[PDB]
Amino acid sequence: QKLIANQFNSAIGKIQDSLSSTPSALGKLQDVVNHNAQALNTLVKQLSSKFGAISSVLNDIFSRLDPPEAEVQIDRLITGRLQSLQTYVTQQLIRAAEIRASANLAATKMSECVLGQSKRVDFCGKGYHLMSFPQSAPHGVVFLHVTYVPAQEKNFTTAPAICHDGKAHFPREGVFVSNGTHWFVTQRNFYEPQIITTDNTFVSGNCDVVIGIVNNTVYDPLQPELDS
Amino acid sequence: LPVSMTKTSVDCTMYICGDSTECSNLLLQYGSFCTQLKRALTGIAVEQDKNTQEVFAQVKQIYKTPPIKYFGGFNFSQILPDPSKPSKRSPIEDLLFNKVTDLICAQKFKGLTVLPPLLTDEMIAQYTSALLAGTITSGWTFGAGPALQIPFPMQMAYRFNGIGVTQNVLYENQKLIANQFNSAIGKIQDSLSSTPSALGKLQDVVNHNAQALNTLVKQLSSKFGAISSVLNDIFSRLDPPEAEVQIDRLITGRLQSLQTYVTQQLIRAAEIRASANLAATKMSECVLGQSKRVDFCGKGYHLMSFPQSAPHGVVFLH
Amino acid sequence: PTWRVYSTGSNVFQTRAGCLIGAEYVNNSYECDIPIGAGICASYQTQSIIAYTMSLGAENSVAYSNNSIAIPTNFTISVTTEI
Ligand SMILES: *[C@@H]1O[C@H](CO)[C@@H](O[C@@H]2O[C@H](CO)[C@@H](O)[C@H](O)[C@H]2NC(C)=O)[C@H](O)[C@H]1NC(C)=O
Ligand SMILES: *[C@@H]1O[C@H](CO)[C@@H](O[C@@H]2O[C@H](CO)[C@@H](O)[C@H](O)[C@H]2NC(C)=O)[C@H](O)[C@H]1NC(C)=O
Ligand SMILES: *[C@@H]1O[C@H](CO)[C@@H](O[C@@H]2O[C@H](CO)[C@@H](O)[C@H](O)[C@H]2NC(C)=O)[C@H](O)[C@H]1NC(C)=O
Ligand SMILES: *[C@@H]1O[C@H](CO)[C@@H](O[C@@H]2O[C@H](CO)[C@@H](O)[C@H](O)[C@H]2NC(C)=O)[C@H](O)[C@H]1NC(C)=O
Ligand SMILES: *[C@@H]1O[C@H](CO)[C@@H](O[C@@H]2O[C@H](CO)[C@@H](O)[C@H](O)[C@H]2NC(C)=O)[C@H](O)[C@H]1NC(C)=O
Ligand SMILES: *[C@@H]1O[C@H](CO)[C@@H](O[C@@H]2O[C@H](CO)[C@@H](O)[C@H](O)[C@H]2NC(C)=O)[C@H](O)[C@H]1NC(C)=O
């Protein structure tokens, strides 16, 4: 418990420095803000376009020419500006679709990673999922995923089954390993050797059909008690 | 599953004006449409490479299969790389590449060009080979941390327990399961070689892009209400007082056509991005692990999956 | 607009994406910053700009055998961000 607590505290301590030091970790939200600002600024700047007219200012056009020519000039300007507005609206609709997709993904992630534990690989982090915590950021969410990663691995010699008294034994929930001399049964994700007994093995058939079976002994807990 | 789309670039001046300078001078007076169009096309181009990176570049290291290829009776010859051919591709990959395929010069002379991808086919093949080596030698352990070796029959026993069937079922039926797997791979190769309509999606993507480019090229033969579809004959046959109307109308028509092209490309890019995201999810949960979701990684109880690369897409064998 | 870079001093490289002038090709392979295309990409280090073929990652080989297994003996808790 103490080691796990210390590791978690160290990770949460380091995450703030990791966020602060790198100035491009929050690039998605900044990209959203920049895209909106650029679209609006471009729409503002389009008002200075002449679009084939004598001038981009309407008052002078009305004050200098007759209705027959002022009409065509202002029609040109009106057409150009309406085209600009329509382009802006279409681009906004496409960006809204993209943001809706991202929001649906965020909702699914908060439902499955924060409100429960997920068995989906690489969905709530890199590794084996434990839990997640949400935080709010301008125009978005930030998930902190806690993950179990194995380390300090060791080699061993394995065997599919153990033949004893003309019977084949298989592990209920573990794997058979050997350190060179003796055989043990251990869980597949953490090394914890144990003595092969009848409690942690089950029998199925004789031992002349399984390729790679290994001779050894299985210790029955009942005999020492009934012999004492 | 399609992953990427063809990257295109468009030159404004050569499309709208061509070889006329006064047309360029007038075009300077219609705003910053070209900056918008170029920016959108560049964004799509970068997004394509991002899609390919997300789908394929998921393993930190490049794993290699052992020199001796014995895996408990399973063959794996039809999906592992072949060292004889220079491209270093599996047979299935070779069929997939050979099954999906002056107009380019005509398009180029009008200002429409195609940019090359960042990742060549050899690099994608190398990534797929690394994924296959990892899933054969290690299992699902290489996607959750360091890669740990485990014999293949024991991996299949674990995957049998994952679907509610005990280990003895595999261990007493090893040869039958191996023979069924080998026959299934052979039938997959034969069926892929025989039927030519299996690769319809990628061909559809390619055809749609080509058709859009052809329509854009053919829009230059329209008059839009002017007196001719060529700028030089308009400028050489009228006075500057009256040529402006014709040139303005032609320019507006061509700008509208090119805007429509850009909008269609944006919508198609959104669809391809959705497909690429689905492909990345499938690579994460069907190849790097075992999935309990029904019908996500095939019809039946999922055991495993193998990736292969195809032109602008991925092929999963479940 | 009259800024041509002639030759030699900036070197000339023929890639599949075009002609590169100003960068020197190197035989090394690095995880690169500025993508150019066709697997060729550039960076800044020597002092000058260098172009190279990007490296996909470190080569690894897993000791596969009929009767060899690897089992962890320790663990690590990791906290990761997703925005
Ligand atoms: C398990 O055994 C394998 C092979 O016996 C080890 O892989 C070797 O590691 C050494 C490093 O000490 C290298 O010099 C060899 O080239 C490796 N051989 C192969 C075939 O890859 C592996 O290191 C062992 N595992 C542990 C945790 O020590
Ligand atoms: C394999 O593991 C067994 C069990 O831990 C080891 O046997 C013990 O080894 C220690 C080390 O000297 C002795 O003090 C014990 O008395 C041994 N117990 C028994 C029941 O034999 C064995 O030495 C290990 N083998 C190797 C090669 O490390
Ligand atoms: C495991 O034990 C069995 C039986 O104890 C061994 O099978 C015997 O091997 C001897 C050879 O020394 C033969 O003479 C016998 O006919 C075999 N059968 C029996 C019932 O004794 C077997 O060799 C041992 N080792 C392995 C790897 O299975
Ligand atoms: C244990 O592995 C070895 C290989 O490391 C197997 O021996 C044969 O090795 C050759 C190498 O040229 C392969 O082509 C064969 O496929 C391997 N098997 C056979 C039956 O020849 C050996 O078979 C493996 N052990 C068992 C019990 O299958
Ligand atoms: C894996 O399958 C391939 C076929 O895809 C086998 O190669 C064939 O071997 C037979 C020998 O009976 C030849 O007649 C065929 O011409 C071979 N085909 C090809 C494409 O090479 C290969 O032998 C199988 N693997 C093993 C270990 O047997
Ligand atoms: C498992 O790993 C932890 C660290 O991840 C090890 O704890 C470290 O042990 C060394 C040596 O005693 C100390 O110098 C460190 O300060 C410890 N770290 C922490 C965070 O307490 C632990 O010893 C490892 N366990 C095994 C069995 O190897």
Residue numbers in the entry:
A (entry chain C): 920 to 1147
B (entry chain A): 727 to 827, 848 to 1064
C (entry chain C): 631 to 676, 690 to 726
Question: Could you give the paper's own sentences about this structure?
Answer:
Omicron carries the most significant number of mutations among all SARS-CoV-2 variants to date, with 37 mutations within its spike protein, 15 of which are positioned at the RBD and cover almost all the critical mutation sites carried by previous VOCs, such as K417N, S477N, E484K (E484A in Omicron), and N501Y. The Omicron spike has 37 mutation sites, 11 located on the N-terminal domain (NTD), 15 on the RBD, and the remaining 11 near the furin cleavage site and on the S2 subunit. To delineate the impact of emerging mutations on spike’s properties, we performed systematic structural analyses on apo Omicron spike and its complexes with human ACE2 or S309 neutralizing antibody (NAb) by cryo-EM.
Single-particle cryo-EM data were then collected, and the atomic structure of the hACE2-bound Omicron spike was determined. The Omicron spike preferentially adopts the one-RBD-up conformation both before and after ACE2 binding, which is in sharp contrast to the orchestrated conformational changes to create more up-RBDs upon ACE2 binding as observed in the prototype and other four variants of concern (VOCs). Superimposition of one-RBD-up conformation of the spike-hACE2 complex and apo spike of Omicron revealed that the one-RBD-up state has no apparent conformational changes after ACE2 binding. The interface of the down- and up-RBDs is near the ACE2-binding region and well maintained after ACE2 binding. The fact that both apo and ACE2-bound Omicron spikes preferentially adopt the one-RBD-up conformation suggests that the conformational change from down- to up-RBDs of Omicron may require more energy than the prototype, whose spike preferentially adopts the two- and three-RBD-up conformations after binding the ACE2 receptor. These results indicate that the conformational changes from the down-RBD to the up-RBD of Omicron may be reduced, even adding the ACE2 receptor.
